[PDB]
């Protein structure tokens, strides 16, 4: 309704005016099918500018990190009605944010049916489950004998809504979910995507074997790019179209302007001799008229000795000089880059001409002396 006589009943069913002068309200506020204890003393007039509002320990732990919000809402808001609206919505928000802690599944469907369906699969298939049962991640095999993983995140009602399927491989996986479909349905769709994309995988597996892949190191399955090393202090990066892998990629070469020119000219001339019936290697070898080195350096592949902020050597005379005091990062920086970066952060403090603050990559103590 309009007036807060009936609209307040309708919108806060469990807030009871204890006193006749409707000044003390007490009891319950709803949010996400759960009722919270709240005692909201007004002054003798209806002014929230000054009021008492006390909580249960349940409520205060859940409204940790909005205390100021609620305190300001009290002083700014005109009516109780609107104030409760703001509070309700704010609780809604707080619980969906802290979704980790708060599940009551309906077990008789859930935990039983999940076990039935996982039995229907067969017991090699699962790899992981969180204790809150929320995460599962599974395996499937290729005809090649390659392991391929899938993350599913399951809701309160698995069979009702879609389970969110989160997955490696490079084109979007799409799942025909019905409420009548189950884990074996989405599993079948996943085996279908496996058998489909085999060519793209075969191509990238051949590359990782025969050549010095440089920039991705133990590459994931989502990777379409492969910075191949060839001769020395010159690299070629190649990105591939996934559905027609065998077809030509956008190719280009990095390194010395005197070394890079002849290859580019030769590519121009010999590109009509690319054919999508052979492999990318068998086409690159006859186009570029060379064979490649098969890990000319495997141990010192590259350490990007470049800023690790702007990722460049030579910023206005300055070189990558400032490093991490850490075995696991070792990451060089520029004075300029690392000063510009640390000058922002809350953790770092500035001594006379000295700044202690966290290495960007590894978050360990790093010191900069200007």
């Amino acid at each position: 309704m309009a007036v807060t006589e009936a609209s307040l009943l309708r919108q806060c069913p469990l807030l009871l005016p204890q006193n006749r002068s409707k000044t003390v309200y007490e009891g319950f506020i709803s949010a996400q099918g759960r009722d919270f204890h709240l005692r909201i003393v007004l002054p003798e007039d209806l002014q929230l500018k000054n009021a008492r509002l006390l909580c249960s320990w349940q409520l205060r732990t859940i409204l940790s990190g909005y205390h100021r919000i609620v305190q300001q809402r009290m002083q700014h808001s005109p009516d109780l009605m609107s104030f409760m609206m703001e509070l309700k919505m704010l609780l809604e928000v707080a619980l969906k944010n802290r979704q980790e802690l708060y599940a009551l599944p309906p077990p008789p469907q859930f935990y039983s049916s999940l076990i039935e369906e996982i039995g229907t699969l067969g017991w090699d298939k699962l790899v992981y489950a969180d204790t809150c049962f929320s995460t599962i991640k599974l395996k499937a095999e290729d005809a090649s004998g390659r392991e391929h993983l899938i993350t599913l995140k399951l809701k309160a009602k698995y069979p009702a809504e879609s389970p969110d399927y989160f997955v490696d491989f490079p084109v979007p996986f799409c799942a025909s979910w019905t409420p009548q479909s189950s884990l074996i349905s989405i599993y079948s769709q996943f085996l279908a995507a496996i058998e489909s994309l085999k060519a793209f995988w075969d191509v990238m597996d051949e590359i990782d074997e025969k050549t010095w892949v440089l920039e991705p190191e133990k590459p994931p399955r989502s990777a379409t790019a492969r910075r191949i090393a060839l001769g020395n202090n010159v690299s070629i990066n190649i990105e591939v179209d996934p559905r027609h892998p065998t077809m030509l990629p956008e190719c280009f070469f990095l390194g010395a302007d005197h070394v890079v020119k002849p290859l580019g000219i030769k590519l121009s001339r010999n590109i009509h001799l690319w054919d999508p019936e052979n492999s990318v290697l068998q086409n690159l070898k006859d186009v570029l008229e060379i064979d490649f080195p098969a890990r000319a350096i495997l141990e010192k592949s590259d350490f990007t000795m470049d800023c690790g902020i702007c990722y460049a050597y030579q910023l206005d005379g300055t070189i990558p000089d400032q490093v991490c005091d850490n075995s696991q990062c070792g990451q060089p920086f520029h004075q300029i880059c690392l000063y510009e970066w640390l000058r922002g952060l809350l953790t770092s403090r500035q001594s006379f001409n000295i700044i202690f603050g966290e290495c960007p990559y590894c978050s360990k103590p790093i010191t900069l002396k200007m």
Binding site: Y66, P170, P219, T304, L346
Partner: protein
Amino acid sequence: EGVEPAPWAQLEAPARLLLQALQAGPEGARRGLGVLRALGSRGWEPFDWGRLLEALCREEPVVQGPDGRLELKPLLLRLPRICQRNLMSLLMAVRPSLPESGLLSVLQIAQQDLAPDPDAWLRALGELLRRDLGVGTSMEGASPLSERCQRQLQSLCRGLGLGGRRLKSP
């Protein structure tokens, strides 16, 4: 007193770096790409975009406009304008290797339906993303640009000798 800790304070450390990373001007976006090669490089070879993508929508509260108005922004309309422009840039660069489920949650925000003073740039970036998924032709006037642009460009293409190509198919 008026300290804000950065809105990505409480995230997955790598993302926190990514979002600090794009903050850095227009070469932000490559810093994006360099970041990603330098994290496929490290022990967390997969970057679960999925975990990042929910977080960009998680609503959280502000008191803006009058002295008092509570409103909820998701991450995207809250964190610094330049990480907005440089995300979308980067998601065009990595469109294939995402789930649609998350993306569309983002794009709905991006489309910016019923706000005053909109993110022209993000909207446009929405339209350029939907065209590339294959779900937002929209049958509409929903192309990246302004009305004002499309009009002042029709206005000038008129004063030129139209060609004997056939490009519209009636």
